[PDB]
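Here we describe the complex-level prediction in full. Unlike the single-chain runs in Section 2.1, the three entities below were treated as one system.
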Amino acid sequence: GTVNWSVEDIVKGINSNNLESQLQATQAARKLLSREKQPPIDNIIRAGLIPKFVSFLGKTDCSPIQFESAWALTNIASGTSEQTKAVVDGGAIPAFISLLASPHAHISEQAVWALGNIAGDGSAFRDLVIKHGAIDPLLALLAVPDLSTLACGYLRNLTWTLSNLCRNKNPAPPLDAVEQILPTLVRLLHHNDPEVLADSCWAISYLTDGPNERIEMVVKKGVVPQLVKLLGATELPIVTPALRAIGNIVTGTDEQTQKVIDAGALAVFPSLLTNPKTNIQKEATWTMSNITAGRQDQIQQVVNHGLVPFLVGVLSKADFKTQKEAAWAITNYTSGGTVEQIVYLVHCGIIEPLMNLLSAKDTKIIQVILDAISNIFQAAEKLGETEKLSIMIEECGGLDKIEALQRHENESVYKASLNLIEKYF
Amino acid sequence: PVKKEKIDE
Amino acid sequence: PVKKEK
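The structure predicted for the assembly as a whole is:
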């Protein structure tokens, strides 16, 4: 009946002014937009249908047309920025926010979904959804004693939409909206559904991707322990956002970094730094770099947890981008560590893999590695062991490469190269 | 992702 | 000991 209609037929029905004919045509439109085979979004837009669908959202008397119009508008808003803009320009936002109060749960959910697509377009639409007052009605739908009594699909859609209201920078969401949402997010981060957890962690990852003040809002709510627990999960869709959030947090102050350490995070990194997913290894090594950039007592906790051999490991063999983060982690460690800590690092075998990476075709990593050699030499100078280190570097193929680098395009390279040679070789 | 189509129900 | 974001 409502399968495989032309746009011309949908228009004729929608312009009928028979509410039932309009309902059938709206359903036909929804079925068009629901096909995965290149749905005719732009034809629907050009036919002038969006305003019609929008006004159908307000027909309380006819709940099916409300739902069918909601779903159609959801799928248009799922497209390009320009397609999302057509929906917004049609007045959909306040109309979807009204539908959040629908007594029919399927209609409520569809409105949640639509607003999620709208907010997910970018900061401007996110903030427009917020200005139209979406947050209160959204949070009201989660105001139950136990999240478990709500339908699974519904809770997941709400969580996802909330995560899109936390998403995007330039600018980041309004501080007062973030404060309003955070308590609910903390509750969702303790729910037992893998998908609710993943999206909750993504939200937290977004909120922590900013200056120390943004991080502090999150860290102050006491979520770091739960993030660390989630970091230990089996499901990669949970670990990925949890790790991103933990990594963001350690870009903050040393006191913010300490919360992560105090919550037990470092005990998961043996797995993370050997994880079979490239991205987890990269992001875990990146996280380590910002912990090695901390205080000496923090560096010492890295040492105590047994993670220096893991850094040696990643430096020795990983995707290049991971090895680059490992180089940073080492340079940070050597920059901030005590003499004893730098000695330990050399005893764990850092010299050969550092030297192997000077063959890299990446000017940045060379500068990072050269910095690290310098800092290590500085620690040797304080021990009168510049000779032993010189020999080690010579014996694993290092001197050759540092020499060659005295004749390198980049200035810092050739400079730091010649300084090392002349002082130590 | 950022946006998601509803495909059936 | 310079922290760097992403």
